[model samples]
Target: MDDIYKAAVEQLTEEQKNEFKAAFDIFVLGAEDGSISTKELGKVMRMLGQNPTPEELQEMIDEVDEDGSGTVDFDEFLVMMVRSMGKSEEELSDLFRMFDKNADGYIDLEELKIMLQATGETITEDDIEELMKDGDKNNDGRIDYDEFLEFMKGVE
Candidate 1:
């Protein structure tokens, strides 16, 4: 008798599903007729004390909006959260961008140094330089996004 929206939604009982609808509508603030704008996610990111980037949120929305209509309907919204298991790779993009303080499409020594050192992690200059050089596929003395992900693969 538990026929619902298949797997994920079936996990939530009737009352919990109601809770989600209420929560879902909250994110529909700026958009009318009940759909979520990609812009709202930037505000959501601010709640996490993050800097906003439109491309970041919009790209994310583009992926989650199941109908591919470029806006998120309630069903798509529910579906998105249920399938949120696709982690790791997306976070690595965030990691790449975080280390890319200059936003120059690459992470250089100084940027890498500060991020690594921020966690009270220390590394000798030669050691860090060697690390970057090891990942520097283009050998331009910087770690590009591709190289960063590749470098992390072995580390994990």
Candidate 2:
């Protein structure tokens, strides 16, 4: 498993990792429509033995929607695997671009928080702020894609 992870990580870009984390979280949360669910989210934490608080779960759900269309679709999910897990891509660039706020070519902490709140997930600006305080690298007040990946890895 470690070998696979090493190889995968070797090829995956920082941006893709962020997208993959969101996609994986969405899958874990059991949104059959390629989205996510609250109960499934709670179950996911238990499955991973993480015991995520409701605030934490809400924080995660906020990050999943790259399009801000209120749900995570196949395109959004596909981009996640392609960039982060070393999967293939076929024109998810626009959606990917939308999520990649800050125009640094990846999703950042602030972008994640904005998307989460856009979806009405009951997350607060301060909740997002706190999450970033711990996860954001370089102390830029916003997590770049790579930092977000490390954060999710710890969670997983």
Candidate 3:
């Protein structure tokens, strides 16, 4: 018989390994910043970190909504330490791999443009060139994964 559980178990572990730690880091930062509604934050956190209970979610909301508006701002989010707000982790990974042209495990301007165009983001070639120029850390006409991550994290 095909062992479905084995695949499930492996998937779960990988999720825990890659996502759990990052989510926990965000949670700790959020707790300090007090910007995001604890309840909403907990929902994302549980999905990314550990499964959470209803009571925990409710308490999180009650704790964070200071003026009863039931929302958190970017200022609060920063304290909460939410990184890469506009992009998903999968998108980030894809961009990184795409930029690593020549499949040689690194990125240069040429690889970056190829990756962007391949992703069909509707970005103009000129715009891509400008963006790459802006993003190149060493001015060597390339961007590494770390530089890309930093750029995305800094985005508003």
Candidate 4:
């Protein structure tokens, strides 16, 4: 989720990033623990133009609280944003570019490993190698945007 938000931020200009940071700060204002209760989450929903009913609010919290902590942390909020906010193609492209550190239009195994680590996933190099070999449809030795997109589709 953090990776997804980082990708989302990459698509924004400096000004937009500042504005987004401001909004995020405001959302977390009363919750210094970096989390918000379901009741507090109602405020965030309204801020996003959503008026959730009591049941709907609970469902929203359930959907975003990946850790089963009963509260939404910053990381979980980011996951929610990526899953529920309807990410654009530009944002996905930015995600691909993030792993393409050298701007080579493809992601190598090392880059894939880095991205997996950034997402808080511990993936073995062997696993990554297998994944790349399976998804490298063009046989270019690296995963391009199309291959990456296909990989993501299969993951979900």
Judging by lDDT against the true structure, name the best candidate: 1
lDDT of 4 by residue, 21-57 (tens): 5667777778756677766888867877988898777
The whole-model C-alpha lDDT of candidate 2 against the native structure comes to 0.58
List where candidate 3 sits over 4 angstroms from the true fold: 1-95, 154-156
Query: Which rank order by lDDT, best down to worst?
Result: 1, 4, 2, 3
Clashes of each: 0, 4, 4, 0
Cα lDDT listed for each candidate: 0.71, 0.58, 0.56, 0.69
Ten consecutive residues with minimal summed lDDT in candidate 3? 76-85
- In candidate 3, what are the lDDT values of residues 58-108, reduced to their tens digit? 564444344565555443332222222246555777867755758776677
The order by descending TM-score is 1, 4, 3, 2
Tens digits of per-residue lDDT, candidate 2, 85-123, equal 322132344545666766886566668777777886687
- Model 2 ranges off by over 4 Å: 1-98, 106-110, 154-156
- The best candidate in terms of TM-score: 1
At residue 16, give the lDDT of candidate 1. Answer: 71
Mind giving the per-residue lDDT tens digits that candidate 1 earns over 1-156?
111234666576778778778877887778765687766677666887987687777776786665777777777776666655223667788878888888999888788778767877566768776666767867787888777876675233
